[PDB]
Amino acid sequence: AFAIFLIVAIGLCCLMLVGGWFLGAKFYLVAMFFVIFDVEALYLFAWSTSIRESGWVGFVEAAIFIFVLLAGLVYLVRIGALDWTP
Amino acid sequence: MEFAFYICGLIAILATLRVITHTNPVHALLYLIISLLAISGVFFSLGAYFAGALEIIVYAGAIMVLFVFVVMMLNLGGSEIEQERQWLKPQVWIGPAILSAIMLVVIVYAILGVNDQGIDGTPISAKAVGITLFGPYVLAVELASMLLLAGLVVAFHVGREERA
Amino acid sequence: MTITPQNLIALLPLLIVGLTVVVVMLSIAWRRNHFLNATLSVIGLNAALVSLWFVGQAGAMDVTPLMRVDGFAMLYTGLVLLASLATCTFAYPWLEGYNDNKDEFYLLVLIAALGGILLANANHLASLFLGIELISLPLFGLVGYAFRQKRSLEASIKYTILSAAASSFLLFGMALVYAQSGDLSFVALGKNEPLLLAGFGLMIVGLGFKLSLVPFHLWTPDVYQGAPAPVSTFLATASKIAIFGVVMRLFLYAPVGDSEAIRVVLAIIAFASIIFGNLMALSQTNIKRLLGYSSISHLGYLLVALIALQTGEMSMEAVGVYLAGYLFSSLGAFGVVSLMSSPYRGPDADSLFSYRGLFWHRPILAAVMTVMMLSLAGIPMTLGFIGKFYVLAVGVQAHLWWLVGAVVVGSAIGLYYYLRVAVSLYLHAPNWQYSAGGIVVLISALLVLVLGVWPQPLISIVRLAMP
Amino acid sequence: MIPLQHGLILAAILFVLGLTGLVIRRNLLFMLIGLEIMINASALAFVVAGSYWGQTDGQVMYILAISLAAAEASIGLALLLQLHRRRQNLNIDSVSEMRG
Amino acid sequence: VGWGGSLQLVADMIKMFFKEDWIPKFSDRVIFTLAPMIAFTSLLLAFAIVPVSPGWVVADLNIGILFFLMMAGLAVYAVLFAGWSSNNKYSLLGAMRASAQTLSYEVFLGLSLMGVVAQAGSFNMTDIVNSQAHVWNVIPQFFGFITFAIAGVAVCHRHPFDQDGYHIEYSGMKFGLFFVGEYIGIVTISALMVTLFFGGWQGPLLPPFIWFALKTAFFMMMFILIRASLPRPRYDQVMSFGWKICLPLTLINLLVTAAVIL
């Protein structure tokens, strides 16, 4: 299962370590955009898990959620924060 | 899950002692990622399936990437070590710890007063969390979005660009 | 439950303001203009005031389990909206002299209005958290607006670390209560074991930072000196006005607040807030630190009413009218401070020694500061006296003799610094929206005078709102 | 089986360890780290509180708790950018004007 | 040499071993030993959720898709820790730039996969591969398909070129370790592209397990084919045609699927 496979993987990692020692700036803010937008889209991860039974009210709810998110992205692009970057 | 719960809690308890104790910031970042993977093990020990995976995607995988970015672009390694350890004497470290001790033991006494009533391994899947979030908690999601969008405006403003 | 048109009419304040953020953000990305953004933001907040009438057509009802809409929340939404209206009219004259990016200001104030009008409507512990943080993020960022000074950034950073710390105390307390109780809904809570009470004390810590209580008041001087005066109008009035509503509703609904174990602790905090405010407030020669010191004492008088909410039904209207009077007094005073900084001027030079004269410089504006400054104290012919009078009556009604005595001796101590500023505006001397800013503070001066001499119409509004 | 006190004790210890870390250490970076260590400890209490009763009351605002943490962390890192850009010292006593 | 084309890779591995490892002075050691593992082991454990067959799925853990995204997040920590261990400005800014590109194109993969999740209605990978009983999830999510392909080849796969010198500082057994990891990385993206979008375990007339693994190679080879086909773009241009034209695509595709399902 998962635990057996993880134990096997970490044992192989320990074995290859054993074999290895036996043989002998600025404009990062695009990054911060990610950090917002991961948590924004994490609510969408919950919604598509049960789209069917939330139904149209959840659909209208999710439409307004991503419209706010898409309006924020257009603001980011059209300001000039999100462009060519270091 | 009981031994799994215990080992993840002690790893989280210990790695947290390390991150408040250590000096090298990158080692502090590394020990706290150990803490965050330990907490996801705790969530999966308890049964919160949409929290253990959720914490690793975001909390150990989005927020701390931004922390790592700032500590390598300041290039602060090699400066402010000697006087920074001179400030933390063990006699200084003892002082506020007794302050935090008072509330910690009161909480321990307050939580030991109640009965056990041990829960079982109840599995809580994402099938109902997405239902409950967009049902009774419908307002929270939309207003929660504004919390992030507000963070975006202030982070562009305080992270304002210039000629340099 | 699902969405019915009754729920949408009830939610109309949270909706108009949210639609305003979207339109303001689109307008910023389209043109990046100060005039259009100020007009668009003030129109949305005025549209929210108009739509308060439409939710008054709707009765006392729920939207979700998170929120409960009553007539109490109608009045608190109104207080927050006029403060947001007040802060944008005071920000245009200050921001005309700002060098660049002059348009993010209204976007953050609009987010803070969403946060304020979400703590008015509360029924579940989570809505309490979605509201506190929605308003903090603009207050995280707007005290750091114009970070080009050496103290705005200082003030922003001190408030940032401390407000995140309070939110972490509130959240940890919020769960330690929910361990005993099966639900976090205010009503469903309490259905006196130490863990519930211990969880309650943690929420008091996380709430008493933002309400500026006695062991948490240390932020209120520094950021009030550091922040721009337009931000101080919002930070003095709207945040704590909105926050006080949710902390009162928790004790009214929750049966645990009926018990005397929490009551004694909050009374001692209220006792010490009055004393530890009004004694350290004397020595200050800075007007912004002076108003920040008085804020601690005003929130203390609100607490000595709140402790006797559970004894007699007059405490509801007492808290409401003191909040209305406290809004008008602080808006007039902080508007005059901001109106002295008609350009950006870099760091504004405001001090009690810098306010010698000011009657032979600008006579009308000195009269407004004097009227409001006498209204803060307890002098009659001002709305602050009627608010002071109800909190004395509430303390007499509930036999809180030490607490009502603290208000009187706190008033006796606090008369001194209000009167110096009132007379220091009479010593010997050492654009269109600016006229609009003068109109706002002059309108407030007329209101506090006529509602001090003639206070009945404001009581009719308050008893109309209270359930 | 794991009872309430064992889980919540993990939550309480982590909050105290978080809070302690922020107070003792000088650098603003470690103050921000302590904020994250104490916002997850509160969230750890909520999940074990929300999983005691066996419903979806933990994961329904555990996400709001980390949304606050994400927004706080983004602005906190931005504040340290401007702080090192103005002055090369990064301790909080650098911005400590208007004393008393 | 070997008589097989893939067996020459094994030859290279032999030509990779028994080289000594030198410790650079004034450099960290814990990331020096662990930063190889995050590029290797993390995508190796992205193969713990691949149902090659219902009798030979690696792990029947209750949530599949999230455990893919988790690893796809930890993929950025390896690029950073190698750059901080290099301790050279020529490598420092390149590691920052390479990690910025990974963070830029990590956004699209989660939002592209939710459309397939929504039409399947679940995360668990056995529930997916029983949903592909008659029609695979490659007809409806064409936009989700192309964006997941672009997001897969952006993360630790050198398809936009621009890779600087941040892996130069490792040249011993760890160079082969990164190389083994990226080879393992490309087969899991190809396998996951098949078993989540196409149908694994189908077999209309031939053993299904063979019928799937056959498609797996086709994508794996196809990625190599396009790697050698498309030239290098400008590093400014990938961010210009990143968030502008990819983030709206997954969300509008998710709404189209929400209208189709509902």
Residue numbers in the entry:
A (entry chain A): 15 to 38, 66 to 127
B (entry chain J): 1 to 164
C (entry chain N): 1 to 191, 199 to 437, 447 to 483
D (entry chain K): 1 to 100
E (entry chain H): 52 to 214, 223 to 321
Copied sentences from the primary study:
The model of complete membrane arm, including the previously missing subunit NuoH, was built into the density map with local resolution better than 3.5 Å at the arm center and approximately 4.0 Å at its periphery. The density for the N-terminus of NuoH (residues 1–52) that includes HTMH1 and a part of HTMH1-TMH2 loop, is completely missing in the reconstructions of the membrane fragment and of the complete complex. The structures visualize a complete chain of charged residues connecting the Q-site with charged residues in antiporter-like subunits. Thus, analysis of the protein translocation pathways indicates that in E. coli, no continuous proton path exists between the Q-site and NuoN. The density of the cytoplasmic half of MTM8 is poor and fragmented between residues 255 and 265, indicating the existence of multiple conformations. Conversely, MTMH8 displays localized disorder next to the π-bulge, indicating possible involvement of this helix in the structural rearrangements associated with proton translocation, and to our knowledge, this represents the first indication of specific conformational changes in antiporter-like subunits.
Respiratory complex I is a multi-subunit membrane protein complex that reversibly couples NADH oxidation and ubiquinone reduction with proton translocation against transmembrane potential. The peripheral arm, exposed to the cytoplasm in bacteria or the mitochondrial matrix in eukaryotes, contains binding sites for NADH, ubiquinone, and flavin mononucleotide (FMN) as well as eight or nine iron-sulfur clusters, seven of which connect the NADH and ubiquinone-binding sites enabling rapid electron transfer. Here, we describe the single particle cryo-electron microscopy (cryo-EM) structure of the entire catalytically active E. coli complex I reconstituted into lipid nanodiscs.
